[PDB]
């Protein structure tokens, strides 16, 4: 469906190109992946030619540009509705009533979608363990710095840095205890190991931990729960190890959920949603309620959502803070619309048409964000994201394991990792090293965001670059705008600006860190009853 072989012969190693075009030109199977794979072969052959024989190359480039358009054509040619699964993930403890209320909106609007709530049957005590490590480290740092936290000029960053040293120490003691327990002849469960470590090291009561563990299992089972361990979601040890290093070494449940969502789409297809997402609002609804010039676009999206919850109360105790601040005629006008009528409030997903080659993704501030995803089972692009994640973790673990296994505290371990990254690095993919350098701090210090570049949106953006340009394992190359929105999750189908979305459960910014520290100081000096 390109220029035929004679055209390129009449317009210009090279023999392989002609047949490679010829194979592609004749290839008339209905397998999109085979078509793409043949397109990919042709491109590499052209490239081989080009480098080794740096008159042909004028028109071979023209074919190269044509091939890029053919990829778009193949993708957009035969779209079909995605499997009607909604995949959610809650790992590490009891799923919250708030999360269940959010999932309930999706289910009520989309009764034909099968709801899966993925959980880890062995790992209900991970969030409890993280809490015990972090809170004990907070008390260490506050008491250590007692003389200086009373000073108004005190840099809250000093508290977070000192606390991190205790956090790193206690994460390492847990993983060493885990390593000895998992190597017994009878393999205990992850929650067996955490329970035993919490009881002996942190004076937790064994019966309350067990009663919490059984409670979490019963609640998730009654709420669409499906176990990632028992349903053969993981088929590669490498991917399970990545999931496990996030679940167990780092306590980063968002990173662990980054892995699980990719495997759920790969194996089943459908839609992935973070539990803080909400169905999109019925279009055209809030043009008749025109929006003031004092309220911004993002805010007005939030205010929209606060209006529905005020009168319908689908989610209990939803914030009305942004809504309340204005004219009562607006509130009354909002009040009549909602009371006049869910399906007129919220958009139904219905058929979400996708290529079986692609994955679609939510956008935020012009950049992809993997809090909402659409993919058919086994799609080529989902497999490219998974390969990106494994490649990124291969590089991370190559440089992190020597540091982490050395007999060193957090400060010296950090320097070995950091020096391993920078002292002998190349300028190519330089930017990736900077983003993963604070990896050990993720979840425990402000502005540590390495997860974005490992298992999150950065892996997706490079996968899209892989797909568009028929490459693999791209690191820091990014697509232009016109290529990127080829993979956009339909905005009409999604409300990203929810109350729960405002608070990240794996990271925090400087303003939140300062407020949290002052809260730690006020409670510390003020005491608790």
């Amino acid at each position, epitope marked *: 469906s390109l220029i035929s072989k004679e055209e390129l012969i009449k317009l210009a190693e090279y023999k392989t190109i002609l047949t490679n075009l010829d194979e592609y030109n004749k290839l008339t199977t209905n397998n999109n992946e085979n078509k793409y794979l043949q397109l990919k072969k042709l491109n590499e052959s052209i490239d081989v030619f080009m480098n080794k024989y740096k008159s042909r190359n004028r028109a071979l480039s023209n074919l190269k540009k044509d091939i890029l358009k053919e990829v778009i054509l193949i993708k957009n040619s035969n779209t079909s509705p995605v499997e009607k699964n909604l995949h959610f993930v809650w790992i590490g403890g009891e799923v919250s009533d708030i999360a269940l209320e959010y999932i309930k909106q999706w289910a009520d609007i989309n009764a034909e979608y099968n709801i899966k709530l993925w959980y880890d049957s062995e790992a209900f005590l991970v969030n409890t363990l993280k809490k015990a490590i972090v809170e004990s480290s907070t008390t260490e740092a506050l008491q250590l710095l007692e003389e200086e936290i009373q000073n108004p000029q005190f840099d809250n960053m000093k508290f977070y840095k000192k606390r991190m040293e205790f956090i790193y120490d206690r994460q390492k003691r847990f993983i060493n205890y885990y390593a000895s327990q998992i190597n017994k*002849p009878t*393999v*205990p469960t992850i929650d067996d190991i955490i329970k035993s470590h919490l009881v002996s090291e942190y004076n937790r009561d064994e019966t309350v931990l067990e009663s919490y563990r059984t409670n979490s299992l019963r609640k998730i089972n009654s709420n669409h729960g499906i176990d990632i361990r*028992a349903n053969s979601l*993981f088929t590669e*040890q490498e991917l399970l*190890n990545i999931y496990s290093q996030e679940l167990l070494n780092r306590g980063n449940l968002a990173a662990a959920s980054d892995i699980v969502r990719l495997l759920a789409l790969k194996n089943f297809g459908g839609v992935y949603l973070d539990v803080d997402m909400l169905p999109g609002i019925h279009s055209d609804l809030f043009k008749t309620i025109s929006r003031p010039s004092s309220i911004g676009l993002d805010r007005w999206e939030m205010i929209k959502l606060e209006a529905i919850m005020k009168y319908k109360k689908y989610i209990n105790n939803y914030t009305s803070e942004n809504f309340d601040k204005l004219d009562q005629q607006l509130k009354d006008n909002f009040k009549l619309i909602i009371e006049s009528k869910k399906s007129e409030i919220f958009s139904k997903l219905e058929n979400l048409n996708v290529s079986d080659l692609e994955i679609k993704i939510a956008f935020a501030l012009g950049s992809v964000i993997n809090q909402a995803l659409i993919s058919k089972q086994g799609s080529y692009l989902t497999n490219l994201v998974i390969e990106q994640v494994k490649n990124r973790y291969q590089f991370l673990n190559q440089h992190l394991n020597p540091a982490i296994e050395s007999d060193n505290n957090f400060t010296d371990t950090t320097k070995i990792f950091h020096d391993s990254l920078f002292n002998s690095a190349t300028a190519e993919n330089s930017m990736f090293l900077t983003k993963i350098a604070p990896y050990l701090q993720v979840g425990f210090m402000p502005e540590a965001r390495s997860t974005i570049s490992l298992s999150g949106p950065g892996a997706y953006a490079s996968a899209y670059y892989d797909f568009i340009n028929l490459q693999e394992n791209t690191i820091e190359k990014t697509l232009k705008a016109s290529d990127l929105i080829e993979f956009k999750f339909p905005e009409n189908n999604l409300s990203q600006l929810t109350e729960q979305e405002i608070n990240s459960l794996w990271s925090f910014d400087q303003a939140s860190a300062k407020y949290q520290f002052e809260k730690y100081v006020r409670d510390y000096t003020g005491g608790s009853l």
Partner: nanobody
Amino acid sequence: LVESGGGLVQPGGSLRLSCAALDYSSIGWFRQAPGKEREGVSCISSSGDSTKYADSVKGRFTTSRDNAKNTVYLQMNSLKPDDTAVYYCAAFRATMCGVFPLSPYGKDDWGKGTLVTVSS
């Protein structure tokens, strides 16, 4: 856990490995070929009423439990060259050997194990 019964077999032949200690634990057989990653092979529940197998051996291998002599067997049949590996056994608190046929994260000692070679 002591693994016994390994040795040579000819392609198409049978062999029965034994794993000697387990009553209330699921038990799994695993294998590791030279230069390859370990992979699960079989698992059997504590009652012995449920079993699970790797795709590559399903319908060729079976596993059973003789509680009385605290020992789980691996009945291998239709042996192939690809079944050449060292075979190890492990017990599990989890139902059906957890993430089977994958291995627990960090678990790097499985005992001595017993070698099986199927050649020529």
